[PDB]
């Protein structure tokens, strides 16, 4: 019982979570993440100050977008600061430069700004925390590090709340991690009645009222994973290896630029999710089966955007990536 | 992928008008999602919002109402049984005194709780005023009775059963009508009407659209079914639990008044026998002398402060007979 306490200890270790933030887990792993973070962080604003302000969404891909549209559905005050789709013809793939939107943010008050660090379906990963949000002290950052939580050294002090579960519209199944500021929780409490109620701020169900979740306290499963990443260098190690894994993969595709298309702009190329397509779309299944033959599986793009997507994880070996690099390079010179 | 649904459908004769589905959470999760979902269902059929109405017979239906209020679902208590005996639960007012508050108002739904566990208050019957009113969708919580109380599923718009955090499972049998109508809301009419919106993870028409569901126990589910199916179904289980309770109450009722049974006979619960000692001094010896006969799990609820006798499906009549004997031995012993 309460191996929770140990896993939490592991997390505050590998991430160096400061005393200013608290770790809590939530049954949900997906959609549950959006709704609960929007309603709770709206209420945290109403606590700290006395009024409501809109929430800011940086839409860099599918998950970003869904997150915003759910804050819209719930009638949480929120606005799309930008939609990367609008800056390269309705398709994701770029992350507009700060200057083109940073002033939509500076000086204005926000309940929080949301972003999705790694956009799994489209292979858009933020190169950096936008510096315009970092320098503003009255903008709380909500980040979804769903893909990179244990593979990208981040500074937990800069974040209002960190979310990591999956990036799948699964049910209530799975778990979402949370690392939230204690400032925020105190302020979620310090607000009710007319304040939240005449302002129209939607009330979060108590099942998901963040302060009540920490007060109410099959999960050894992750405490195990936390332990293997520990010792083996921690997050910084796993980052450096995932980075290396991707460098090799991308070079193979860039090299045979005659044969493949990498549709995501290099600046925001995801290291966990590599997305590419064949210029001759009549050889996809030939590609899929030859790869099947080589025990290199899990490459068909999600059945929406199509094409191909090679996912990199902490458990993957550099030599297993190099096996795929070998096939990619061989298939292009073959055709 | 086990359709434990099929055995529930057989267990309760669930008609084709209704759909079984499950949700993770028990406890509060059911309060929250049923109120905003069913409020939306009203904006489906009609253009407007009507208040939800709550029949507060004990602590659980009280807490449902209080959460709907917190959430800003339009909702009102039709009665509160506490008012009809000195602010103490234990009674259900004659429907004469509230019939017309039902029949002459517009309600999204009317909520009642079949069995209030903490106070041992159970509805003798589904209220005839609710059933005759064609404009009232009944939302019933049979959380301690779903398998020991024969009911007519067609009389209900929502039957929900769990227990009384995010843990456990809440079971749902819902009119297909209601589902079509929560899908048939506009989302914009709901913003204007001020109706709070349920997070899509708990949006009933999507929860039924596909799923995932934390399982492994879902096997235990049809396990508990099927047995009951082959014991003679819910009717047999009901007759049995009735027997266990009738011999228990006879032991309390037939004393020279050594014990108090606070629940009115009209509305005494078959699953939770609440009782108390006329001379409170002896309540500590009561529990020791009971452990001396291997009878445990008998102390109040930390709030009410008397003694509870929670009858369930497993509890043998022999076991309640032993308890009957210890009640009858202790009252004579300590005359």
User: What secondary structure does DSSP assign to B151-197, as a single string?
Assistant: --GGG-SEEEE------SEEEEEEEHHHHHHHHT--SHHHHHHTPPP
- CB of B102 closer than 8 Å to CB of B133: yes
Best mutation site among B29, B163, B200, B208 for testing chain A: the one with the most A CBs within 10 Å? B200
CA B67 to chain centre: 16
For chains A and B, what is the number of CB pairs under 8 angstroms?
77
How many angstroms separate the CA atoms of B113 and B59, rounded? 10
User: Quick one: tokens of B206?
Assistant: 């999507």
How many angstroms separate the CA atoms of B82 and A191, rounded? 30
Q: How many residues does chain A have?
A: 335
A63 counts as catalytic? yes
How many angstroms separate the CA atoms of A288 and A300, rounded? 7
For residue A289, with 0-12 CB atoms within 10 Å meaning exposed, 13-18 middle and 19 or more buried, which class applies? exposed
Edge to edge, what strands does the sheet with A273-278 contain? A260-261, A273-278, A308-311
Residue-wise burial string across B67-77, b where 16 or more C-beta atoms lie within 10 A, e elsewhere: bbbbbbbbbeb
Looking at residue A307, the DSSP 8-state letter turns out to be: S
Percent helix, strand and coil across chain A, each to the nearest 5: 45, 15, 40
- CB of B99 closer than 8 Å to CB of B79: no
A126 counts as catalytic? no
- CB of A245 closer than 8 Å to CB of A231: no
Cβ count within 10 A of residue A212: 17
A103 counts as catalytic? no
Q: Say which residues have a Cβ less than 8 Å from residue A41's Cβ, sequence separation at least 6.
A: A55, A111, A112, A140, A142, A160, A161, A184
Identify the H or E element spanning A229.
helix A220-229
Active-site entry in A168, A182, A300, A329: A168
Residue A128 bridge partners (DSSP): none
- Contact: B213, A30; criterion CB under 8 Å: no
B33, B196, B201 ranked by CB distance to A32: nearest: B201
- Contact: A197, B72; criterion CB under 8 Å: yes
A282 is in an annotated binding site: no
B212 is in an annotated binding site: yes
- CB of B20 closer than 8 Å to CB of B101: no
Identify the H or E element spanning A124.
strand A124-125
- Contact: B70, A206; criterion CB under 8 Å: yes
Best mutation site among A207, A211, A213, A214 for testing chain B: the one with the most B CBs within 10 Å? A207
How many angstroms separate the CA atoms of B288 and B295, rounded? 9
- SS3 label, residue A199: coil
- Going by their DSSP bridges, the two strands A78-83 and A124-125 should be labelled as unpaired
Closest residue by Cα to residue B262 from B302, B293, B230, B305: B305
Resolution (angstroms) equals 2.8
Q: Say which residues have a Cβ less than 8 Å from residue B305's Cβ, sequence separation at least 6.
A: B276
- Contact: B67, A206; criterion CB under 8 Å: yes
User: Quick one: tokens of A55?
Assistant: 């929430």
Identify the H or E element spanning A273.
strand A273-278
B170 is in an annotated binding site: no
User: Quick one: tokens of A168?
Assistant: 């799948």
Q: Which of residues 141-180 of B touch A (CB under 8 A)?
A: 165-167
How many angstroms separate the CA atoms of A157 and A164, rounded? 16
Chain B positions in Cβ-Cβ contact with residue A73 (cut-off 8 Å): 187, 197, 200
**For chain B, where are the E strands, in sequence order?**
18-24, 52-56, 75-80, 110-113, 115-116, 121-122, 138-141, 158-161, 169-175, 259-260, 272-277, 307-310
């Amino acid at each position: 019982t309460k191996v929770i306490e140990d896993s939490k200890k592991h997390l505050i270790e590998l991430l160096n979570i400061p005393d200013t933030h608290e770790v809590f887990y939530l049954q949900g792993g997906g959609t549950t993440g959006f709704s609960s973070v929007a309603t709770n962080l709206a209420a945290a604003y109403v606590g700290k100050h006395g009024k409501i302000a809109p929430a800011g969404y940086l839409v860099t891909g599918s998950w970003s977008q869904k997150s915003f549209e759910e804050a819209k559905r719930l009638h949480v005050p929120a606005e799309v600061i930008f939609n990367a789709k609008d800056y390269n013809n309705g398709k994701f793939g770029k992350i507009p430069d700060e200057s083109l939107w940073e002033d939509k943010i500076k000086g204005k008050a926000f309940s929080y700004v949301y972003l999705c660090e790694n956009e799994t379906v489209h292979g858009v990963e933020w190169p950096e925390l936008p510096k315009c949000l970092v320098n503003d002290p009255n903008i709380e950052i909500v980040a979804d590090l769903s893909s990179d939580i244990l593979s990208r050294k981040i500074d937990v002090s800069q974040y209002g709340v960190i979310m990591a579960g999956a990036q799948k519209n699964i049910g209530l199944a799975g778990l979402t991690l949370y690392i939230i500021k204690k400032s925020i929780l105190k302020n979620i409490s310090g607000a009710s009645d007319e304040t939240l109620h005449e302002l129209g701020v939607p009330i979060t169900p108590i099942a998901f009222d963040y302060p009540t979740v920490v007060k109410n306290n099959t999960l050894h499963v992750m405490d195990l994973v936390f332990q293997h990443i520990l010792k083996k260098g921690g997050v910084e190690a796993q980052q450096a290896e995932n980075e290396e894994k991707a460098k090799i993969l991308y070079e193979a595709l860039d090299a045979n630029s005659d044969f493949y298309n990498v549709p995501v702009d290099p600046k925001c190329r995801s290291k966990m999710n590599v997305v590419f397509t064949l210029k001759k779309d009549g050889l996809d299944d030939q590609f899929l089966k030859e790869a099947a033959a080589r025990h290199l599986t899990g490459l068909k793009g999600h059945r929406s955007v199509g094409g191909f997507r090679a996912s990199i994880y902490n458990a993957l070996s550099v030599k297993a990536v190099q096996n795929l690099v070998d096939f990619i390079k061989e298939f292009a010179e073959k055709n």
